[PDB]
Amino acid sequence: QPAHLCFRSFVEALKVDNDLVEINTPIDPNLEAAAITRRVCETNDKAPLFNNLIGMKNGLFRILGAPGSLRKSSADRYGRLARHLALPPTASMREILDKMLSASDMPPIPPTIVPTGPCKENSLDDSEFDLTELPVPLIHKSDGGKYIQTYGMHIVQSPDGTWTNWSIARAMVHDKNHLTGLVIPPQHIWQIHQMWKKEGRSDVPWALAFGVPPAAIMASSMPIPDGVTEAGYVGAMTGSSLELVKCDTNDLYVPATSEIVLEGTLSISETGPEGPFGEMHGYIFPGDTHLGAKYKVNRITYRNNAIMPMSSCGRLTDETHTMIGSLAAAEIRKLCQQNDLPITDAFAPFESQVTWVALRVDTEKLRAMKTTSEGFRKRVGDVVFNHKAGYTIHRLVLVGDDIDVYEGKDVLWAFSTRCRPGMDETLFEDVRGFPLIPYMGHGNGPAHRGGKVVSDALMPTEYTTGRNWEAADFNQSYPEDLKQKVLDNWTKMGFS
Amino acid sequence: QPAHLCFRSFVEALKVDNDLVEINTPIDPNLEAAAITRRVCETNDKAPLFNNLIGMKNGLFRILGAPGSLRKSSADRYGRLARHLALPPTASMREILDKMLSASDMPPIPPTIVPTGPCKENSLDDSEFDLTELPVPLIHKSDGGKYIQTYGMHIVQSPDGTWTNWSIARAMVHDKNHLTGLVIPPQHIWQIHQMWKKEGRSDVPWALAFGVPPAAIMASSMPIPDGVTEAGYVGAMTGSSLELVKCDTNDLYVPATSEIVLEGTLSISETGPEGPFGEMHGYIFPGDTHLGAKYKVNRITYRNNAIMPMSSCGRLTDETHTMIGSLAAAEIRKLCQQNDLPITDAFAPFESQVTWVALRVDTEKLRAMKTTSEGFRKRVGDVVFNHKAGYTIHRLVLVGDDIDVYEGKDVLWAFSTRCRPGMDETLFEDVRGFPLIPYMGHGNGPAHRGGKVVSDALMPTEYTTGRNWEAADFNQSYPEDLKQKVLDNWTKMGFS
Ligand SMILES: Cc1cc2nc3c(=O)[nH]c(=O)nc-3n(C[C@H](O)[C@H](O)[C@H](O)COP(=O)(O)O)c2cc1C
Ligand SMILES: Cc1cc2nc3c(=O)[nH]c(=O)nc-3n(C[C@H](O)[C@H](O)[C@H](O)COP(=O)(O)O)c2cc1C
Ligand SMILES: O=C(O)c1ccc2ccccc2c1
Ligand SMILES: O=C(O)c1ccc2ccccc2c1
Ligand SMILES: [K+]
Ligand SMILES: [K+]
Ligand SMILES: [K+]
Ligand SMILES: [K+]
Ligand SMILES: [Mn+2]
Ligand SMILES: [Mn+2]
């Protein structure tokens, strides 16, 4: 089965790519696996596969770190992401994001139910497992718990059965048969929880599947629209109906080749201590413990030789940057276009810790709008910051046709030189804010509201008559014939 | 004579360092030399020495490009700058800026007058030279003239003789015996021009010396205080009195080993067409011609085999970044400390196109101030943005003790995660602005006023009780013994 549709096949693809290091000597899930993984992410090294984890009992479990992190080379920088999607490993970010958006104007391809799959090879009932006795990693030294859940798929369904949501949200072990985790607005796991709580009859039937089909974990990380079942969107994106098997203890369906499946309920009443956690912006606030949602685990099923994927998240560059940022930016691009805004491309620069999105403007179309910076800034911010796709993003940077938004250097150059602080910006204080950003949840202002800005790095004539500068760079400040002569004579003259 | 005190010796030092490429085949000063230089700066290659310039007549002239640009290696990244100052080529930016600040609390060492020097080897009077017949470079394809002056030293003196200023300011050829250039407030060449214009008696006696002592061109690029004679400050910084020779046609003094000396006057009445020019922020606005100051050239003296230094300025990274930004930041650091602000370090991040300065705060001292973000932001901005040293800088970023301001990645991380847009910022609209920044001179607002901001990336507890986070990075989120094990076993496990 293909790498994009089967996690076990994806691990083999990383091996064949020489993009894996198999560590067959004992590694401690208490910090060591995540430390190795963290160093990998900070240095764009090969993904580590920990085949010998201290505390692995009855096939639970191996760990793959850095499943969606970057490669060292520019030529296949995004190759792990490309391996999630059946794309060539040399795929550009534009090509990855266009693949992730391709299902947005296709009919869903609903999933196919099969009677069994590898995820049923082993099972443990409510008398046979203890989540405190599994080799769950301690990812950061001050974490408030062992974070079993960084790269699995929560599966919850609306009470009426019409929407089944797949998403990533963190969770840690609370006791032998419970997790706690973040369930916050406006996330779809929270929207669905709210539906069950207002019905008031029962806890939310739930499953958490780890090592799901790579194309499914990408959609799990993407803010596709409210009410859209991720299974059908991944089906349309891949052109293949996903095979799912029923859970043993509830009527939800999990990917048939899931490495590890937890079945149980998400409580509509109970909470427990959650966090702190070393998070995507690069911080942990030690002893910052809050109350989180509480999950009850009734059953575990798993593959022989099961592999748990793990994100050791924090400072650049890991899955919280390459997937959270980039996939939000893709949905923002589409959202702007659907609102008749002349946006061609969007990307969350890694240098902004994926708190900015750079929006490339088709300035020919902008000129035909006969508008102004203040007006256009206001319109773009109202569209993006009042939508769920804009949740994690606190600064939008508008740039003209000459900027490649996928090149952080060029975004920073445009931002720094074409946007006058204050005058070329509009602040948004009455929009939902992302509290995980330290200046929000641990800052001077409301944790959940405001602190957003649209920064216009379009120059004045981009709205009227056209770009009125040339860059003072090799590309733009010299004629073609000269540039080519210089390049052709470069090593002859003595340069490197 | 030592490399820091003699430009010819500095060129030999770059050769011996394997940091030079001598191009002995003919190179066109019309764009080709500057294109090669531009590519060098964009790729941190070796400095080009053009020994065979098309149009060189009677020893005028060779060109050295990229005299203060970066080297490829991290280990000697700033080695060219270190060669300006007698520092080891492995010098850090902190060490370079501390050397440039060292004269600020020393008695000046006045210059020594000598009767002759290499700069008198050749001369051309008012009947013998034609500036349009020299191989003056066209640096960018849309420049409004041939910019003879990018890395020479203007020498002007107050009418009362008590202050002699050395500075870099651009100038281009106007006709056979005149230049035009930018003379703008608050620059010292402009302050002195104003003194002569209010006296009203005569044009300003002037000289422009190219290929001056490297330590002297660094001070020329630094905003040392009003009324301070750069010669005495370089003397104190180097511990050696600079040897100067009198001009032939006026009573100014030039460095004895100057490669090329123009003598004449800066007009208190005349102007001429100046620019456009490909400038430090990375832009040219073609046909943007303004009126500039007008210089009359009465005499040229020069060394046998004279070498003209040239900055091919624009996008990263050249002398307009490494010297303008860094030397402003050094003077800002000192200015803050003199105003009892607890600043330890300052640097202008290259990623900001040197329009930001990051200020590292001693947060133990900050806590003893018992102050707030708004108050402290306001105080720092009032100090820096109402002083000449803050002129080119439009954003200040305040960061705590954990940030290395010399590491752009860490500044961007702190800025992006610890400064809430709007709430944690103070805008300054009633301060002098830098019109060369495109969002100023070609923007939506007043070209010369406002558009400045203090961005506070100090977290709330940095003002009260102390940092209350750990980074989610390899360094901070794992214990020492574990980190060292991981590093010691890194190649054994299979990593690069
Ligand atoms: C490694 C990783 C960790 C994540 N952690 C969280 C988290 O703890 N909580 C959260 O709400 N979203 C988290 N996300 C992001 C969500 O997956 C993303 O916002 C997605 O759009 C949610 O799905 P939904 O649109 O169906 O709600 C994470 C994503 C990744 C790649
Ligand atoms: C390559 C280069 C080009 C420069 N061009 C200019 C310029 O055209 N005009 C200007 O006023 N300053 C220019 N500067 C900056 C000044 O040298 C700097 O602001 C210095 O502080 C001026 O000296 P002063 O403090 O004695 O006025 C340049 C510096 C460098 C390194
Ligand atoms: O509970 C977090 O660490 C976290 C991380 C990333 C997140 C991304 C989008 C929404 C919520 C998020 C929460
Ligand atoms: O006339 C410019 O291109 C220019 C370049 C750098 C400058 C630096 C400080 C002050 C003025 C400046 C002017
Ligand atoms: K999703
Ligand atoms: K703008
Ligand atoms: K100076
Ligand atoms: K702050
Ligand atoms: Mn969803
Ligand atoms: Mn001066």
In DSSP notation, A231-253 reads HHHHHHHHTSPPEEEE-SSSS-E
Nearest-angstrom CA–CA distance, B196 and B190: 10
* Technique behind the model: X-ray
- Tell me which ligand sits closest to the C-alpha of residue A183: 1
Instruction: Please list the alpha-helical segments (H only) found in A370-459.
Output: 373-385, 408-418, 438-441
Find the A150 Cα to ligand 5 centroid distance in Å.
14
Q: Which of A345, A344, A342 is nearest to A367 (CA)?
A: A342
Q: Chain A: nearest CA to B200, how far in angstroms?
A: 38
B281 touches chain A (CB under 8 A): yes
Q: From the list A284, A429, A437, which residue is nearest B470 (CB)?
A: A284
Ligand 1 pocket test target in A64, A139, A168, A437 with most atoms within 8 Å of CB: A168
Task: Please report the residues numbered 151 through 180 in chain A whose beta carbons come closer than 8 angstroms to any beta carbon of chain B.
Answer: none
d(CA A62, CA A152): 14
Q: Which residues, including other chains, have CB under 8 Å from residue B126's CB and lie 6 or more apart?
A: B177, B298, B299
Tokens, residue A305: 């030789």
DSSP 8-class letter at B323: I
For A24, half-sphere exposure in the C-beta direction (CA atoms, 13 angstrom radius) is 1
Tokens for A488, please give them: 């052709």
Report the C-alpha gap between B397 and B415 in whole angstroms. 7
The strand pair at A153-157 and B283-284 is best described as unpaired
Among B380, B403, B401, B391, residue whose Cα is nearest residue B354: B391
> Quick check: B357 and B332 in contact, CB under 8 A?
yes
Select from A91, A77, A9 the least CA-distant residue to A44: A77
Residues ≥6 apart with Cβ < 8 Å to A82: A76, A88, A89, A90, A91, A96
Please tell me whether B169 is known to bind a ligand: yes
Which of 312-341 (B) contact A at CB < 8 A?
313-316
The preferred substitution site among B139, B154, B187 for testing ligand 2, maximizing ligand atoms within 8 Å of CB, is B187
- Minimum-distance ligand to the CA of A100? 5
Contact between A171 and A206 (Cβ < 8 Å)? no
Is B467 in CB contact (< 8 Å) with chain A? Answer: no
Q: At A359, is the secondary structure helix, strand, or coil?
A: strand
- DSSP letter (8 states) at residue A446: -
Cis, bond preceding A495 (omega within 30 deg of 0)? no
Cα-Cα-Cα-Cα torsion A271, A273, A276, A280, nearest 10 degrees, comes to -20
Helices A326-338 + A93-101 axis angle, to 10 = 60
Residue A364 at interface with chain B, using a CB cutoff of 8 Å = no
In A171-262, alpha helices (H): 188-199, 214-220, 230-238
Q: Measured from the CB, is residue A149 less than 6 Å from ligand 1?
A: no
Please check if A169 is assigned to a binding site.
yes
Q: Furthest-apart CA pair in chain A: how many Å?
A: 79
User: Measured between CA atoms, how close is A273 to chain B, in angstroms?
Assistant: 19
Is the distance from CB of B295 to CB of B171 less than 8 angstroms?
A: yes
Residue A146, both tokens: 């062992």
Q: How many CB atoms lie within 10 A of CB B266?
A: 24
- Nearest ligand by distance to the CA of B164: 10
In 3D space, the residue among B82, B80, B103, B102 whose CA is nearest the CA of residue B92 turns out to be B82
Residue nearest to atom 7 of ligand 2 (CA): B169
Residues with CB under 5 A from ligand 7 (ion): B 167
> Does the distance separating the beta carbons of B421 and A494 come in below 8 Å?
no
Residues found in chain A: 496
CA distance A193 to A125: 25
- Cis (ω within 30 of 0) for the bond into A61? yes
Contact between A76 and A51 under an 8 Å Cβ cutoff? The reply is no
Which atom of ligand 4 is nearest the CA belonging to B181? Answer: 1
Partners of residue A313 in chain B, C-beta under 8 Å: 472
Q: In what order do the strands lie in the sheet with B452-456?
A: B343-347, B356-361, B395-399, B452-456, B425-428
Chain A residues in contact with B483 (beta carbon < 8 A): 35
Pairing of the two strands A253-255 and A204-210:
unpaired
Residue whose C-alpha is closest to residue A121's, from A50, A206, A65, A58: A58
Find out whether A191 is annotated in a ligand binding site: no
Q: Name the residue in chain A with its Cα closest to that of B372.
A: A444
Query: A187 a known binding residue?
Result: yes
Q: Are A371 and A361 in contact (CB under 8 A)?
A: no
Q: Is B437 close to ligand 4, i.e. is its CB under 6 Å away? A: no
Backbone torsions φ then ψ of B459, nearest 5 degrees: -80, 160
b/e B180-213 (16+ beta carbons within 10 angstroms → b): bbbbbeebbbbbbbebbeeeeeebbbbbbbbbbb
Distance CA A355, CA A440 (A): 12
Of A25, A423, A496, the CB nearest to B451: A423
Q: Does A481 touch chain B (CB under 8 A)?
A: no
The DSSP call for residue A488 is H
Ligand 1: does its nearest atom lie under 6 Å from the Cβ of A223?
Answer: yes
The answer to whether the CB of A185 falls within 8 A of the CB of A432 is yes
DSSP run (H or E) holding B493: helix B480-493
Q: What residues have a C-beta under 5 A from ligand 9, the ion?
A: A 165, 188
- Return all residues near A281 (Cβ < 8 A) that are at least 6 apart: A353, A355, A436, A437, A438, B417
Q: Where are the beta strands (DSSP E) in A323-416?
A: 343-347, 356-361, 395-399
State yes or no: B187 annotated in a binding site: yes
| Structure-token pair, residue A229 | 């079942």
Q: What is the resolution of this structure in A?
A: 1.4
Q: Which ligand is nearest to the CA of B419?
A: 8
Q: Show the 3-state SS of A30-82.
A: ECHHHHHHHHHHHHCCCEEEECCECCCECCECEEEECCCCCCCCCCCCCHHHH
| C-alpha B458 chain-centroid distance | 28
Sequence ranges of the domains in chain B? 1-330, 331-459, 460-496
Q: Does A424 touch chain B (CB under 8 A)?
A: yes
Q: What is the CA radius of gyration of chain A?
A: 23
Orientation of helix B480-493 relative to helix A32-43, angle to 10°? 70
Residues of A in contact with B351 (CB under 8 A): 351, 409, 412, 416
How many A from CA of B168 to the centre of ligand 9?
59
Does the Cβ of A311 fall within 6 Å of ligand 1?
yes
Question: Using CA atoms, how far apart are residues B75 and B56, in angstroms rounded to an integer?
Answer: 37
Chain-centre distance for alpha carbon A337: 22
Q: How far apart are CA B411 and CA B399, in angstroms?
A: 8
CA–CA min distance A358, chain B (Å):
14
A246: region left, alpha or beta (phi > 0 left; psi from -120 to 50 alpha): beta
Say how far apart CA B195 and CA B215 lie, in whole Å. Answer: 27
For residue B258 and ligand 2, the question of a CB distance below 6 A is answered with no
DSSP per-residue letters across B37-70: HHHHHHHT-PEEEESSBTT-BTTB-EEEE-TT--
Q: What are residue B416's phi and psi, to 5 degrees?
A: -70, -25
The pair phi, psi for residue A235, each rounded to 5°, is: -55, -50
Residues 6+ apart with CB under 8 A from B75: B90
Interface of A with B in 175-234 (CB under 8 A): none
Check pocket membership of B64 for ligand 2, CB cut-off 6 A.
Answer: no
From ligand 2's centre to the CA of B404, what distance in Å? 26
Give burial (CB, 10 Å; 0-12/13-18/19+) of B159.
Answer: middle
Contact call for residues A469 and B283 (beta carbons, < 8 A) = yes
Q: A with B: how many residue pairs have Cβ under 8 Å apart?
A: 284
- Give the DSSP per-residue string, A95-129: HHHHHHHGGGGS-----EE-S--GGGSEEEETTT-
Distance B220 CA to ligand 2 centre (A): 7
Q: How far apart are the first and last CA of chain B?
A: 46
Tell me which amino acid residue A350 is: F
If one counts every other C-beta atom within 10 angstroms of the C-beta of residue B63, the result is: 26
CB contact under 8 A, A453 and B422: yes
Strand partners, B453: B395, B427
Identify the CA nearest to A324 among candidates A115, A168, A161, A158: A168
Is A413–B282 a contact, with Cβ atoms under 8 angstroms apart? yes
User: What is the token pair recorded at A443?
Assistant: 């800052």
Q: Mutating which of B279, B416, B424, B482 best tests the A interface, going by the most A Cβ atoms within 10 A?
A: B416
Task: With CA atoms as reference, report the closest residue to B72 among A164, A105, A496.
Answer: A496
Do the Cβ atoms of A274 and A289 come closer than 8 Å? yes
Q: Which amino acid is at B299?
A: R
Place of tokens 């004629």: A479
Half-sphere exposure of A133 (CA within 13 A, CB side): 9
